[PDB]
Amino acid sequence: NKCVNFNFNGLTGTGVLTESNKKFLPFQQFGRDIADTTDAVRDPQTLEI
Amino acid sequence: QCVNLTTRTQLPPAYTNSFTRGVYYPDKVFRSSVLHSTQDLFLPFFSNVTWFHAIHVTKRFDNPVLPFNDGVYFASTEKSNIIRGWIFGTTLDSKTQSLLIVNNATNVVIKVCEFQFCNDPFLGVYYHKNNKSWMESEFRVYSSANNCTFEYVSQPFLMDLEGKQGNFKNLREFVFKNIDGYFKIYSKHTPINLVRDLPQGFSALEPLVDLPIGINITRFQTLLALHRSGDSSSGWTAGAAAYYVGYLQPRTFLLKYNENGTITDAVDCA
Ligand SMILES: *[C@@H]1O[C@H](CO)[C@@H](O)[C@H](O)[C@H]1NC(C)=O
């Protein structure tokens, strides 16, 4: 809930992280919206999307 | 020690048609409700794949030495876990570094080692009439192995090994690729109710492992179990089993994802 510069397993970006209702598959790390812009990320430590 | 089995009838080769098979996730990037174009090594739709059979009825024991051009799609319609693993290399005689992936009765072995692979690698299961029980008895693949770097052994389990009767039930689809010095294995697996064919339909393979081996693979062979309960080269049964081999080529495919991340339809542009 804050503008944060984040780095998730080499994926670097800026933005606010919020709880998500999206359900990722076990083998999927991050999800891209249309146009291949990062939209969601699974934090590897606790596998929270 | 190895023995080259005899009592094996020679037939031509056979071939079959693969209907929209050999599709995996090209990348590890989750996409949901999207129509993605991707260029990569795929198995073309409505392709012809080499058919190898293992039937009791001859005994049709197929385990030839197949090339490995740029990747292989390997499907297996099995009932009693006859196919056990694979071997990949260049010369297979410990001159050059080979790879083997085996699934014996207890463990899953993955070695990248300098094996002196013999002409007829296989495994042998022994069946006891005194008390009906099947379990691995013989492991004839490889003679010697001196220099090697990469091993992996999985936590011991207990495996069926028993020979059922009926039609094939389990479809095992596997994709092997060797690129950037990475051996990439995609796998997936599906209950079937056919008798003799390799189903139609769609199913996207998901990646299973990425071995960082970086060897030079040009040929490979499958290795599958035989049943015993004759001589050293005659006393063995095959067991119902079939497996299909295809040969990946660089293609554009236009994949469809669901509202999920799972690939629910693809089309070959060429
Ligand atoms: C596709 O498979 C083989 C490839 O060697 C070829 O001989 C065959 O005629 C082609 N068509 C069919 C129907 O198998």
Swiss-Prot record, chain B:
Changing residue 62 to A: In strain: Beta/B.1.351. Changing residue 58 to I: In strain: Lambda/C.37. Changing residue 6 to R: In strain: Delta/B.1.617.2, Omicron/BA.2, Omicron/BA.2.12.1, Omicron/BA.2.75, Omicron/BA.4, Omicron/BA.5. Changing residue 84 to I: In strain: A23.1. Disulfide bonds join 2-118, 113-148. Changing residue 77 to I: In strain: Iota/B.1.526, Mu/B.1.621, B.1.1.318, Omicron/BA.1. Binds to host ACE2. RBD also interacts with the N-linked glycan on 'Asn-90' of ACE2. Cleavage of S generates a polybasic C-terminal sequence on S1 that binds to host Neuropilin-1 (NRP1) and Neuropilin-2 (NRP2) receptors. Interacts with host integrin alpha-5/beta-1 (ITGA5:ITGB1) and with ACE2 in complex with integrin alpha-5/beta-1 (ITGA5:ITGB1). May interact via cytoplasmic c-terminus with M protein. May interact (via N-terminus) with host bilirubin and biliverdin, thereby preventing antibody binding to the SARS-CoV-2 spike NTD via an allosteric mechanism. Attaches the virion to the cell membrane by interacting with host receptor, initiating the infection. The major receptor is host ACE2. When S2/S2' has been cleaved, binding to the receptor triggers direct fusion at the cell membrane. When S2/S2' has not been cleaved, binding to the receptor results in internalization of the virus by endocytosis using host TFRC and GRM2 and leading to fusion of the virion membrane with the host endosomal membrane. Alternatively, may use NRP1/NRP2 and integrin as entry receptors. This is Spike protein S1. Changing residue 195 to E: In strain: Omicron/XBB.1.5, Omicron/EG.5.1. Residues 1-270 form the BetaCoV S1-NTD domain. Changing residue 204 to V: In strain: 20A.EU1. Residues 54-62, 124-146, 155-167, 228-240 are annotated as: Disordered. Changing residue 231 to G: In strain: Iota/B.1.526. Changing residue 54 to V: In strain: Eta/B.1.525, Omicron/BA.1. Changing residue 195 to G: In strain: Omicron/BA.2, Omicron/BA.2.12.1, Omicron/BA.2.75, Omicron/BA.4, Omicron/BA.5, Omicron/BQ.1.1. Changing residue 136 to K: In strain: Kappa/B.1.617.1. Changing residue 172 to S: In strain: Gamma/P.1. The gene is S. It comes from the Viruses. Changing residue 6 to I: In strain: Omicron/BQ.1.1, Omicron/XBB.1.5, Omicron/EG.5.1. Glycans are attached at residues 4, 48, 104, 131, 147, 216, 260. The chain holds residues 14 to 292 of 1273 of the full protein.
